[PDB]
Every structure is written in structure tokens, then in C-alpha cells.
Amino acid sequence: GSELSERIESFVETLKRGGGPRSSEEMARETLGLLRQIITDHRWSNAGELMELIRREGRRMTAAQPSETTVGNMVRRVLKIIREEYGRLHGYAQLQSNIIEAINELLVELEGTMENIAAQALEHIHSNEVIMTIGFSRTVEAFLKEAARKRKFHVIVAECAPFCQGHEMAVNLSKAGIETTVMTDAAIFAVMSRVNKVIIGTKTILANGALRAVTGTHTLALAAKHHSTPLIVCAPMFKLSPQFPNEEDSFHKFVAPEEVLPFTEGDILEKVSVHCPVFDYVPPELITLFISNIGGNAPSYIYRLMSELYHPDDHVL
Amino acid sequence: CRFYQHKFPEVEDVVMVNVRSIAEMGAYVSLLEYNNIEGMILLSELSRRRIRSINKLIRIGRNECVVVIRVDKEKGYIDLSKRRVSPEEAIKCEDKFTKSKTVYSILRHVAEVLEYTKDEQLESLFQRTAWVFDDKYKRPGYGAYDAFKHAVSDPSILDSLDLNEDEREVLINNIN
């Protein structure tokens, strides 16, 4: 049963350094897989022992890299599943089978997420209109080049100044022939007048409806609230996590300060500290629409799902 | 219009009551089969699900039969229960309700034809006559029951009250 432990390591490591896997929903999938293995390579006197074990493991997971809590909420929902099963079917052993199907169920639903969102797109964006996006958020490449087969419009993609992370989407939408444009984040307020409804990615959905986003997003949402054009969060619901913003501000992945001011610059690096947060906050009171697996949703709406998805008694995990 | 020789019904009496007003601890149920007996009713488990339910104002008046679990006279109420009931007893209470309605129209036509402007006196005469006609059959207010049983050929039992021939006239007329 140590092969389980070695796969656990393999992940925990690939997690604990940097981009891996470079896709988010992928991370979710490998997560669920490893969880399934934890179950199918273990037994329990009572399901409480399995709850305990998966809680320990999820603690290691989220504590390792609290910047990406996706897997945090995956183990949360798995705790929900076992909670629900021991609730129903004892309110004893064969229910292991039960558990497994749930995973598959969850799993298979996950496999449709992207395409689900696709169906919404063809509704919102009426043609020849201007949409703004910050990043290469796969869900949004899906969104747009899946609503660019019946209409035509204009998407301007900003650029997270740390990376070129807001250029790959430009080259992709070029490969999809939509006549999109590139720009430098500092100029978003420059053109925020001529936007219609910003379509932004997201990286988590706190239980306050406050999304932690790829950096250079707080300014986008603030410019939006100013011009009062609406915010289109392309957040599949698995990206939730029942964190409520204020704890300890282990909050923004502080990536290699090499990014902003590269090391080539002489001695000035002796009294010049550096900051480079790749993930910023956006207050929920600016959100408009949680385009999601179940269609339109508003800020408050989100805790409803946090009511149902993750059993509240385990946000301390 | 009083109720019967049982002006204060006893236990196991399943009154046909309506819901006068939805409430918090339990819907205040009121009936006339005991001359406006009013009490509560223990809100059920799936009736604790009446939060998101529709229009607590709708379904106010649509009467139904309920059993009387507790009882009180000076405390002035009755705790009616619904979840633990049967529809055969519902049909029996429907029969008793038809009898009640018959007796109510009877008292109305008494007040009209016999000009009984008085309420307590006329209602007590009627209730005594009904108890007389009833205690031989012992059914729930069997007075009018025997009245319509014998009124096919012999409703002359009204001789005891030789005060208004319009009484038996309207009886044998509105009957058939």
C-alpha cells in the first residue's frame, strides 16, 4: 500500500514547486484520482476513520501550497460525499462501492464543465461588441472561441505584466480568426470606456463571493465598477473553496521576484526589496455574473452552493 | 345555533374544522360543529417545512376533519391532530357534517317560519328535541337523523311541540 504513498509524494512535490499541472481542471482530475486511490487502497473500522485520514491528507495538501486551494475543496467535497453516505445508509461496509460511484459521478460531471459553459456563451455576447479579458484562462478561450462560430466581435486581452500570460490567448484567438487585440495592463482604464462586459478568468471563489484572481484583476474590476459595465466570471463551480478572505494573508503566491526586476541590474539590489504577487483580491461587491455550470449567478448566490457543496463543519479542515 | 347536547365535545371527537389563521406554534383551527370551537393543531414535521411553502394565507378556509387529542373547558382551546387519521372516519365525519348542515338549515327555517327571534331559548328547545330523538339511536346528534329516517312517512313526532305547524311543514317540504 506504499505505492499510494509514493503517488502522494509525486503529486505533493509536483505541486510544491511551480506550474503543475499547468491546467487547473487537470489538477482537479489528478486530485480526484489520488483521492480515489486513498479510498480503494485503504479500509476503515467506521467511516469516521476515513474522514480523519482524508482530512489529514488534505491538510498536508492545502498547507503545502495554500495559493492553489482547488484540491482543498476537492478533498472538501469528498468529505461531503462520505458524510452524505454514512448519513443516508446508516441513518456499513458495502457502501465503499457507494463512495466510488459518487467520485465517478463527480468526476464525470467535471469532464463536462468546459463544454457546459460553452452553451451559455452563444447567448450573452451579441456580435460586433467589445469584450475585455485578463489572462489565458482556459475556460475563457473555450467561452469565446465557442461563441465565435455564429457571430463575430472584438476581444481585447490585457497582459499580466509579470508574464506573457495574457498573450497566449491572443495568439489562440488569432488561430481562431476573431480579430482580437493585445494591450499593456496599465492601459485598461485607458480603454475601459469602450468595453462592454469584461470577461475575466478566476482562480478561486471564496465563500464571500470574493474571487481571488490572477493579478492585474483588481484594477480591471475596479475600472468596471467605475464604468459600471458588468463582470463575467468564467468560474466552473469546482473552483470554489469555503475560505473567507481574512486569515493570516497567506493570500498571494509570491513568485520569484526575478520577474519584475530581473537580476541583471547591478548593485541597486542591495537596499531595494521587491514584491510580485501573481494573485490579487477582488471585492465581491463588484461581481455581477458567475457564469457557471448551472447558468447565471450573482455574488450572494455563491454561498448557497457553499451551503450545499462542502459541509460547513470542515473549513478548518 | 348551538352544536348538540355535547356543547363541549369530549376526546376522540374528530371535528370538521377550518383553519381560521395560520400561526407559529400551530394553525388556529376553528369549527362550528361545537359552536365555534377554536384551538391549535400541532404543526407537523413536513409542515415545519411550511417556510418556503406557498401562501400561508391560501388554504386558510378549506375545512377538514381532525381528532381532538387534548381537551379543555376553562382553558378554552382544543389541540386537533391531522397526521394520524383515516379516511373512513373522514367519510363518517362527512355524514355527521351533512347532519349538522341539515340541522343548521332547520334552525334557520325555525327562526324564519316560527319567528323565534330569541336565540338561546329556541336553540335549547331544538337541542332538547334533537337529544330526545337522538338518544334512542345514540349517533352523533341523531335527532335530525331519525327525523329524516321517519320523515319519509312519519315526521308527526313534532306533536311534542304543537307550537308551529310551519316547522314540520318546512321539514317535509324542503326534504321532499
Added chain:
Amino acid sequence: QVPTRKDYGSKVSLFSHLPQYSRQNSLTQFMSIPSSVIHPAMVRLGLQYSQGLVSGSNARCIALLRALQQVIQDYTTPPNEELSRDLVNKLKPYMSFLTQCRPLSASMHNAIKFLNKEITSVGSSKREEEAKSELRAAIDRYVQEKIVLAAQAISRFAYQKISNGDVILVYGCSSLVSRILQEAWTEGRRFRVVVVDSRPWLEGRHTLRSLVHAGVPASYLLIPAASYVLPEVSKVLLGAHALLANGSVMSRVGTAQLALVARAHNVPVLVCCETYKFCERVQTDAFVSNELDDPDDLQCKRGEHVALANWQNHASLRLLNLVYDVTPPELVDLVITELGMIPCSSVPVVLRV
């Protein structure tokens, strides 16, 4: 298949998706007047929709519903086909013909969708007479606890709000509102009422009458003059044609405007909208669900040289009379419904389950 409503108007660019039909090019010109392929009661309803005879939201609802009441009660099934399928079928092209003669709001959408869910939720065992009768009775319970009970409940609930002396704003033909206002005034509480109305379909006169003929001191003025009465009105009291996913409200061409200005002068915003209205889609924007009506019913009277009679006759001209706008939940304070006096941004949850 069906005769097609002929698109009328130099459709503006930003609203091409939704159609600009009208009421002069009647749809019944082509149809085989023997109402066989198209049921007679449904088609009479469809027509008196095109002519815009029935306007009130829940009014249009009850209209459609009693029309399908007649349809069912006179409907018969083909030989050897289960009703809960061919009925759904027969309804489908009738709904289509409806959307042709007059686009269908979310109200009648919820209506027809519920009726389909009911039709299908009963199987083969349905005896024809008893099947049609049970559908009658279910349609009844539906209309009862959704539009002639929800109304009285909304009113019996909101009545506690309206204090004395506080003049109240209203927007037009929202029958529900008029019922609330009357059933309030008749309880001792006192107030004036200001009414607001907008072109082209000048309408508040419906509510204006239904008020004054119940003895409430009233006042009435077009919508751009809103700012003149807002420093006095203490509570606005809108209507609503639908409740959407995010939590917004939709209503006639105006109501968003009044919501906005009345937020500006800090006067609390009411909305009154009974549950079954509540749809499930979302609309953050205000341009992707709006049932554009005719252009040439827009104009007014100037001497006699009505400035637009030559409508298409120019080159560039492109008119429009948007019908529904949407107040985001950022303004609407309190949505009274029979379920409670819930706050706006908390609607979709408590009405979903």
C-alpha cells in the same frame, strides 16, 4: 410550415437578433381559416395578442391558460397514442405560433413549462375524460394559488408597510399593484398616489382609472418629469414582468429609469412580483432579451405633419421601442411576495427550491 410574420422595420444593428413584428401585417392572412391544423381557441388568443388587446402580465397569463383550458377540454387523442406525449407535441407548434403572433414573456414561459411538466407526469393509465378533467383541476389549482391567491397574499402582506400620509409612486398597468393599492386604501390608511407613464403605449390611465374610481387622491405625469416628484414621494412601488437568475428585476421600458433616479434621491425602492413570475435565466446586460415592437406606432401628433410618417422612406432611419429593461439588484431594495418581504439580491435562492 406556418405562415410567417413578416419582419417589419429597418432593424437597428444592436438589436437584430430579436424581431420587429407589428400589428398591421396580420398573421391570419394565409392560414387555412378552417381551424384544424391550428386550434380555434388558441388561434383566437394568438390573434387578440397580435392586436395587443391583452396587456397585463398575469392577465396575458390567465388568457393563455384558459385558452389551453378550452383546447384540452375539446382536445381528443389520435388512435393508439399515449396522451402525455402527443399532447406535449400538439402544444409545441401552438406555442410556436404564439411566439410568432406575439413574443412570450417569462410569465407564460413558466406557465407552459409547468403545464408540460404536468402533462408528462401522468402516464398511459389516464382515461380520456378523467385525464382532461384532472388537467382542468390542476390548471385550476395553478391559477388559484399563483395569480388569484398570490395577489391577495402580496396585498395582505404589503399593507402593513404603507404608513399614513406617505404619497407613493407607481408605474402603470401593473394590475397587481392597483389591487394592492385599493385593498390598502380600503383599510383606513391614507395617502396620495403619483403615477408615471411613458410612450408609445401610454397606459397608466389603466391604473389611473382603477385607482380614482376607488377614491384615492391621485396624480400622474410622464416619466421624464420624474425628478419633479421624487423629492416628495417616499416609497416607489413598481411592477415587474419577471425575476431573473442573478436577482434583478425586469419590467416595462421605463422601470429601470425610475429605479435609478429614485435611488439617487434616496427614496426606498419597492417591487411587487408574485412567485410564478420568477424565471431562471440571467441578464446582466439589458439588450439580449427585449421584445421589440413596431416602429410606426411610435409617433405623436404635431399639427398634422407627423415628423416620421415617411419612416422607411429616408436612408439612414432606424427606429425602435424597447419594451423591457432590467434593474440590477444594485438598486431594488425590497421585493414583496407571498413568501415574504425578501430583499432583492436574495431572491433566486428562496425561489429556486
Added chain:
Amino acid sequence: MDDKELIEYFKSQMKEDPDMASAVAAIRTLLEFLKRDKGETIQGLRANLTSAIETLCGVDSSVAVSSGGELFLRFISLASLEYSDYSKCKKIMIERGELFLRRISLSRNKIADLCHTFIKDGATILTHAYSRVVLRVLEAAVAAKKRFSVYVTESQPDLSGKKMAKALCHLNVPVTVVLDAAVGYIMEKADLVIVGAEGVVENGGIINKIGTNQMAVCAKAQNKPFYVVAESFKFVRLFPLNQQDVPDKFKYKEEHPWVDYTAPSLITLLFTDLGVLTPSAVSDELIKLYL
């Protein structure tokens, strides 16, 4: 058994315990009455408790006590009463009542170790009154060995802030008693404002002592995030829209309110033993819980 001993018993309970917020003292005395009701009925006891709660409301002008009465009335008939004798009912009923007592006692500790992790270290906390719950949650956050200051207002009509200081500095925390009218001044220099509440309205905002709202409004314009604490029972089914609307059974005890309301547009994060909230969630939770 009569209403005299009920009111004086509430008085005695609050006197032997100023540390027990009026609501819980009321509910306690209410259970006490339920014990020695010496009745044998179901509804005939509902009438008794309703009348008694009316009296208590007519004695103490707080929203807390009447609201707790409503909620107790709810939480004696929550599921199937299992109506069997109209007497054993009373037994199981008062059992659920003492359980209600349990949760109401737990409320504070629950909300404290729910919140005391919300105070970033080295910032100025600006309370508003002798909010027992605020004092407790602070006391907690201190016990976790943090650093932060305290600005307290003084809520003019009665000296509240003076009392809160006199009892907080007993914990040796940096304390500074502004003059409540000066809130607009120190509002520049404190980051976030914890404020005690005395009743939550069904759309998310809170109702609280005289100055709350204006403080609230200041602490929104400058984007300074705005907190609030209130345990379960102080939810209320009162939905004003204007500060004039709040019922006048609360507003008294020349003409000057004692409590007033803040729109939920402003309140940025609740605190309820039910958990962290989001004012619309207070609505949803109220419609659900109240029953």
C-alpha cells in the same frame, strides 16, 4: 405565578447579572415560568407565554428580549410535538428549551473563536458601545497574543464607551475613548470597525445604538471594511426602509432615538454563531431558521 413575579423575576435576574445580555435573562425567566406554569394544556400555555413576553417587551425596551421570545415560541414547536397528553409535551418542550439555553450560552465563545482570527495584527479596532460580544471577541483575539489598538466611542445618551474602556483596559489593551461625535475624525486611521449589534434585520443590515448608522456610513465611504457581530436569536422579522420606519416600541425607554438601522449595502461581513455570513445570507438564513 401571576405576571407580577414574572416581571420582577426578570428584573432580579438582570440585577444579579448585568453580565447577561437582557435577551438571555428574559429567556431564562421565561423557562422559569414554563416550569411553574401549573397548567395542563397545549395552546393554553402558548397564550400564557405570549402574554408574558408581551409584558417583558413592555418592561425592557430592547429588541433582544422580544426577539428571543419569538424564537423561543418557535423552538418549542419545531418538529412533530408527538401530542400524546398535553402534559408530557410540556416535558419534552422544556427539554428543547433547556437545549436552547445551551446554544444561547455557547453563542459568545462560538462567535469569538469564530472571529478573533479576522483581526489583522497591528491595526486599530473601533467599537461603538458596551457590546458584550465585542468585548468577548476582542478578549479572545488578545488571548491569542496579537497586537492592535482600540478606539471606542461613547454613545452619548448613556456612558457606554467609558464603561467598555474601564472593563477592557483591565485586559491591558491600548484604549482611547473618542467622543462619539468625532467618529469622522478617527475614521481615517483605523482600518476595520467591529461593532456590536442588538438585532439583525431580515435583509442583512443591523440595528444598534444611536450612532451606529452614521459611523457605518463614514466607514463605508473611505472603503474601510466594516464588520459586525450578533449571535443567532437577535435575528428579527422587521424590515424597515427608512430610519423613521424602525418600530417605535424600540425607539424609547427631548426626543432622541436609542437604536437605529443600517442598510445591508454597507455591512460587509456578519458574524453569527451560525457562521460567517453575507447579509443576503442573513435573509436566507432568517426565512429558513425562523420557521
